[PDB]
């Protein structure tokens, strides 16, 4: 019945959450995107309403922004993915009940990546707005660098950045294996 | 080469014509037409265009138009009106408007943002929005914020939308789009 479907929906969501984290960790972003679309479709169905599915959903949301943050005028999004990731991080802190101290480093990381990635994609205009808006020795360099100079520290790695954010997010998640994976292994 | 320049010239006329019709639809509360015209414009924006103001207005109008709409949206952390707040700031900045000119409209959006969340069962978001963007009315909402909307928490979204359009419209050019002028001449 309804309760049965809801129970399975929760199982399914948690399994895919697990597999998406695995794909992201192994840098299989294509698989992460596909698995995330499945979870996106399942969210319309009734789930364990109150369940901690919400924490799981914020994480997926944060990872989605980061995964696309490296990429015409979009009438549907004023913010660049990473600027949006900043908002999500504030929601994770508030929802996971994290102290400002445990989140501070990640924040600054997302903020720096937000400006730098825009510079690398050659959009100093947006890099400027973001730089001015968010976030002092680095600021100067970036501003000066905003004068169109890439060979200056603008040589960071988005991969290294993504993986570091994933570890931050994982450090606040349970380590439990999804019931479906458990059954899959037992089915041999 | 010359063909590409001609196509760009037409794309601009088309974009401006539909912008004019989008505003007309919005002004006449024909939001269905607004959405359809807006989708035409979105498809146009990917093509070579040989304005940025026209873009921000459509963006702002788009968030407002969907401000009352109803699961977990993994694509957007912010409610439409929260996003409208950002767009309006970009408009103030990009349109070089004084704070005295934007202040009134800014409060309207913020107020609608909380009231709309209240009109839904989203009391937490309501409180979250208020404690972030926003003295009596502020207290009145904090007070109302408790499963009881009949206390003023029953305003007019239609009035809100038209006031916003009027404000946005006050900073635009009144000239008719070239295509509309040609259409009128076609009847003569
Ligand atoms: Mg009317």
Interface contact flag, A73 B55, Cβ < 8 Å: yes
Phi and psi at residue A27, to the nearest 5°: 55, 30
Phi and psi at residue A109, to the nearest 5°: -65, -50
Q: Residue A187: CB partners within 8 Å, gap ≥ 6? A: none
How many Å apart are CA B36 and CA A76, to the nearest integer?
14
| CB nearest A75 (choices: B38, B77, B78) | B38
B120 burial class (0-12, 13-18, 19+ CB within 10 angstroms)?
middle
How many Å apart are CA B26 and CA B165, to the nearest integer?
8
Count of Cβ atoms closer than 10 Å to residue B106 Cβ:
17
How many Å apart are CA A94 and CA A97, to the nearest integer?
5
Label each residue of B135-175 as H, E or C: CHHHHHHHHHCCCCCCCCCCCCHHHHHHHHHHHHHCCCCCC
* Contact assessment for residue A114 and residue A130, using Cβ atoms and an 8 Å cutoff: yes
The Cα of B61 is separated from the nearest Cα of chain A by a number of Å equal to 10
Q: Which of A148, A128, A130, A40 is nearest to A80 (CA)?
A: A130
How many Å apart are CA A81 and CA A169, to the nearest integer?
17
* Residue A97, phi-psi category: left (phi > 0), alpha (psi -120 to 50), beta (remainder): left
Q: What is the DSSP letter of B101?
A: H
Runs of H (alpha helix) within A43-136: 53-68, 81-95, 100-120, 124-133
Q: Which of A131, A158, A134 is nearest to A144 (CA)?
A: A131
Q: What is the DSSP letter of A78?
A: S
B59 alpha-carbon distance from chain centroid: 6
How many Å apart are CA A35 and CA A16, to the nearest integer?
6
* Contact assessment for residue A98 and residue A92, using Cβ atoms and an 8 Å cutoff: yes
The secondary structure of A2-56 as a DSSP string is HHHHHHHHHHHHHHHHHHHHHHHHTT-HHHHHHHHHHHHHHTTS---TTSTHHHH
How many Å apart are CA A139 and CA A133, to the nearest integer?
11
CA R_g for chain B: 19
How many Å apart are CA A64 and CA A24, to the nearest integer?
10
Structural element, H or E, at residue B170? none
* Contact assessment for residue A85 and residue A119, using Cβ atoms and an 8 Å cutoff: no
- Determination approach: X-ray
Interface contact flag, A61 B71, Cβ < 8 Å: no
* Contact assessment for residue A37 and residue A14, using Cβ atoms and an 8 Å cutoff: no
3-state secondary structure of B70: coil
* Contact assessment for residue B91 and residue B147, using Cβ atoms and an 8 Å cutoff: no
* Contact assessment for residue B11 and residue B44, using Cβ atoms and an 8 Å cutoff: yes
Residue of A nearest to B46 (CA): A72
* Contact assessment for residue A134 and residue A127, using Cβ atoms and an 8 Å cutoff: no
* Contact assessment for residue B177 and residue B17, using Cβ atoms and an 8 Å cutoff: yes
How many Å apart are CA B109 and CA B117, to the nearest integer?
12
A117 burial class (0-12, 13-18, 19+ CB within 10 angstroms)?
buried
How many Å apart are CA B116 and CA B145, to the nearest integer?
12
How many Å apart are CA A93 and CA A107, to the nearest integer?
10
The Cα of B151 is separated from the nearest Cα of chain A by a number of Å equal to 29
Interface contact flag, A87 B71, Cβ < 8 Å: no
Q: Answer positive or negative: Cα dihedral of B26, B31, B34, B39.
A: positive
Q: Which of A110, A109, A116 is nearest to A150 (CA)?
A: A116
Q: What is the DSSP letter of B59?
A: H
CA R_g for chain A: 19
* Contact assessment for residue B160 and residue B112, using Cβ atoms and an 8 Å cutoff: yes
Per-residue CA distances from B66 to A102, B32, B47, B61, B106 (Å): 36, 11, 26, 9, 17
Q: Which domains can be identified in chain B, with CATH numbers?
A: 1-188 (1.25.40.210)
Interface contact flag, A78 B71, Cβ < 8 Å: no
Interface of B with A in 53-92 (CB under 8 A): 55, 58-59, 62, 71-72, 74-75, 77-78, 83, 86-87, 90
B172 burial class (0-12, 13-18, 19+ CB within 10 angstroms)?
middle
Q: What is the DSSP letter of A173?
A: S
* Contact assessment for residue B126 and residue B118, using Cβ atoms and an 8 Å cutoff: yes
């Amino acid at each position: 019945e309804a309760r049965l479907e809801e129970a399975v929906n929760r199982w399914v969501l948690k399994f895919y959450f697990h597999e998406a984290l695995r794909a992201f960790r192994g840098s299989r972003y294509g698989d992460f995107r596909q698995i995330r679309d499945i979870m996106q479709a399942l969210l319309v169905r009734p789930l364990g309403k109150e369940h901690t599915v919400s924490r799981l959903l914020r994480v997926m949301q944060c990872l989605s922004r980061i995964e696309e943050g490296e990429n015409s005028f979009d009438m549907e999004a004023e913010l660049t993915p990473l600027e949006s990731a900043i908002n999500v991080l504030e929601m994770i802190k508030t929802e996971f009940t994290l102290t400002e101290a445990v989140v501070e480093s990640s924040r600054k990381l997302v903020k720096e990546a937000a400006v730098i990635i825009c510079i690398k994609n050659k959009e100093f205009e947006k890099a400027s707005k973001i730089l001015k808006k968010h976030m002092r020795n680095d600021l100067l360099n970036i501003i000066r660098e905003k004068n169109l100079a890439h060979p200056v520290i603008q040589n960071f790695s988005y991969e290294t950045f993504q993986q570091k954010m994933l570890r931050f997010l994982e450090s606040h998640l349970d380590d439990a294996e999804p019931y479906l994976l458990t059954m899959a292994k037992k089915a041999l």
